[PDB]
Design a binder for this molecule. Structure first.
Ligand code: HEC
Ligand code: HEC
Lengths: 104, 104
């Protein structure tokens, strides 16, 4: 994926509720630093729903591709109220950005 | 926005389900008094959906512009069954009316 395009998608669609940088603030949603390789619902210092804590999957490209297409379908009971990103290429670009931004 | 045009839009498209005045009754939808500056899904005495309670954003001009364009896109799971207002000028006029009427 294209990280430059992914950053723009993040700003447009996600930044209302999330930060990505190390030590970045929790907003409506959790700060996402450290996301990849982590079990669902373990953002440090954030109060997740039981649903997000109990999904049990490991965040990576494939599980994010599915979640971000339709969050409530993947995690019924989530408090993330976001319709999803329909286009596969857009999710791929977004996820490439997240992979970079949440690990630097 | 044009408050007088906004009032007409409100009567035509919204009043079947909503009141705006202080102490106004809940109908299908919540009374909207006090809307601006409030987090989503906090209308006093009204039973909101989890989705409207969890969206977690603050109502204001920009967030209402987006919500009213396509309610279910912004708040998937909403029980507000309303298509939206397509035209930006109409949304802006409506929102100007709401900003006045829900604060007086
Ligand atoms: C506010 C209306 C949100 C928008 C827009 C987006 N997200 Fe979100 N997200 C939000 C909340 C409230 C939560 C917690 C959900 C819960 O039930 O506890 C989340 C969670 C996520 C997660 C999971 C984090 C984890 O398990 O560690 C991810 C990966 C996530 N959000 C990503 C994300 C992206 C990439 C968005 C733009 C496409 C996005 N969210 C939008 C609230 C909101
Ligand atoms: C009945 C068919 C509706 C019409 C027409 C409109 N709205 Fe509505 N609205 C309705 C319901 C049942 C709800 C509650 C939704 C839920 O899931 O809990 C709402 C909610 C709103 C809100 C949010 C209120 C809040 O979070 O405090 C707003 C701002 C709102 N409605 C505005 C609104 C406007 C301006 C309308 C005309 C364009 C309108 N609604 C139509 C039901 C119905």
């Amino acid at each position: 994926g294209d990280v430059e395009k992914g950053k723009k998608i993040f700003i447009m669609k996600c930044s209302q509720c999330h930060t990505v940088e190390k030590g970045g603030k929790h907003k409506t949603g959790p700060n996402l630093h450290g996301l990849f390789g982590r079990k669902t619902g373990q953002a440090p210092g954030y109060s997740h729903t039981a649903a997000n804590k109990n999904k049990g999957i490991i965040w990576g490209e494939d599980t994010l591709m599915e979640y971000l297409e339709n969050p409530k379908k993947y995690i019924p009971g989530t408090k993330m109220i976001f319709v999803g990103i329909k286009k596969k290429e857009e999710r791929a670009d977004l996820i490439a950005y997240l992979k970079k931004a949440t690990n630097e």
